[model samples]
Target: HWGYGKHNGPEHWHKDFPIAKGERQSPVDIDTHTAKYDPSLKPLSVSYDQATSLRILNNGHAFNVEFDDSQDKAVLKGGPLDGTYRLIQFHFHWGSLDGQGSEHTVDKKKYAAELHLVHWNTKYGDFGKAVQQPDGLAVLGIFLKVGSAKPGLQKVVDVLDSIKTKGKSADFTNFDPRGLLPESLDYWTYPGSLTTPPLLECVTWIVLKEPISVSSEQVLKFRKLNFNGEGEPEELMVDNWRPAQPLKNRQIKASFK
Candidate 1:
């Protein structure tokens, strides 16, 4: 039900949501300090079957996936990490044009877009309540770069035609998100907060160093998302991503050989 008007852009979100003024916001600038790297961290392990239980949902603002956590076979393995984390939801942040849409920045450079795959620890019983705890969540960050040819993302974009109108969504019945994961699993791990309101500090971030490519046309399609109303002209949800935050003496490590 949220869209952009004169008083309804990103700057006005905090006024309505109220909790957006917190310290633990997302799209943080990654600080790589040799002193913070921990050699003991293990890599995250995920299998193919574990990636199939994802369910795509359309929450009006964007399309996201809701994972079935009751199935624990897909748990993340390695790193000082030992608990069963369930994939909960996945969403994206894009730019107005094809040039910039990412949330996290590297040396002040922005990417075409960014995707977040959200997960929660099973110990909390369910995804709804776990978000309130400090150690209850894990998020995977993936960058999107624009190019001439579309990668395999047509599987997602093809369906956009059906949901062109806002507040409308069709069942994304047979979709596998693992197909969207980058070829390289090597990632930068850190402690961060939710990118949106309430800005909870309960996140273990895993940002893939390798980025995925989507066609310039695909990027244009994402820009067609409407911010006004369902029947109104499409206003574009591009550049909805937040800027990177300060490191504040935090550590960032990678799981690579």
Candidate 2:
């Protein structure tokens, strides 16, 4: 499914997946002009608990690190958002070496990639069940810029050699995701849909204004995976990101104050 290419990438998501329509899709860009705002629309609160374990999952798309919900290492609380949500999976969206694409857009500008930390409310049982509820999910989006080398992504890059091929994944032992978080927690918040197909509109998106850097080499490594197979000559894995969708009438709120 990760190698569906440009023409059929998202088109081939899930056969039995519901909500496949375009209206529920994501990666919407935000533009602002109105001065009046609601302070109540602050980004969902996330608290870091150092005791949680991170589980790595291949998931046939990108390398995902799933947090152990039982440990309560990363807890999300407060805001207009209620209930205790558990960190489930964190994945990335990227572009080809020569193209421009990202998961979240700011004022019509598309970055190289976007990283998402996904969580679901525990009240609905698991992620699968929570995904169906309108207020069951929360996602934090971090933009990636390519230029200088970034230390934050070093842990992920260190494992690139192992997963260089498609369908290849290794368990990341004793890893904590808090290292990936940006220095600033301030963010822009909105209610939006999932960036991938089946594109459920159940996510509360909190996009960080601050972007982290990745080396051009690190980006190229992500593109080195085979679109068809892991051992069958590497294919460019770049441009794996989606274009920005229309924001419609949605309002984006910031936590800068």
Candidate 3:
């Protein structure tokens, strides 16, 4: 029941989830100078099929495109990860007041928004089973910039009207996620959490260096999607992001120099 509002904000989440103050929390600012350049890192290998895309859901947090991960049809490999990780779902985060909703920052720069494509280690079979293990999850962070309409996102944007409220969902398919990525696969990585409630210390965050641009027109409509579900008064679905957490002793790694 935690949210990004005055009464139930991130500052008050610790009251319920003690791990809100735990080590390895997510959305850390990527320090360019401090991250070690690991040339040994391989280019990220992603194989996602449009047919694998199942549906979309508005959980009041964000609209997520869920996939059928029961098989190896869609998965991520290489990069800062070991073995294969199945693509579970992908969601987004943004701010209403301004263009600084990205969870992770690079050189202290916050983009207009962010996208998270979540994957879980195939060894664990399912995301729920892998949620508590050290190398259980991998989240690819794609920063969103405001510009012209991105054809890749057109389909995703089209469905926003159907799921205009929280808990609302609709059929969304034939979507390819690769088109939404930037040209450069270069990225920064670290160990982190879910960035939300029940924040577990299980994610290996891989944040891409380049950002994908979407038209200001698209960004405006994206913010209008509802937070309040059916029968509830209108609540703007903005500022659903968590502030960067303390890094503690974590060392962020870069795939390029």
TM-score of each: 0.85, 0.86, 0.97
The Cα local distance difference test for each model comes to 0.69, 0.70, 0.89
Tens digit per residue, CA lDDT, model 1, 1-257: 12333455556657665545555556676544442456787777754365544444445556675556677745665564558677766788888766677888665678989988787888888877878787788888898888754455676777766655556666665556676678888778777788765567778888887888888888877776654447676566556776676666566776764
| Candidate 1 collision pairs | 3-227, 4-227, 28-245, 42-79, 94-239, 95-239
Local lDDT at 172 for model 2: 71
Residues 67-140, model 2: lDDT tens digits: 67765667776654687777877888888742365767777778888889888888888889988988889888
Report the Cα lDDT for candidate 3. 0.89
The pairs that clash in candidate 2 are 95-238, 95-239, 96-238, 96-239, 166-230, 223-237
CA shift of 92, model 2, Å: 0.8
Highest-scoring model, lDDT: 3
Determine which window of 10 residues in candidate 2 has minimal summed lDDT: 15-24
lDDT, candidate 2, equals 0.70
lDDT of 3 by residue, 68-142 (tens): 888888888999899999998999999884459888988888888999999999998778889989899999999
Off by over 4 Å in 3: none
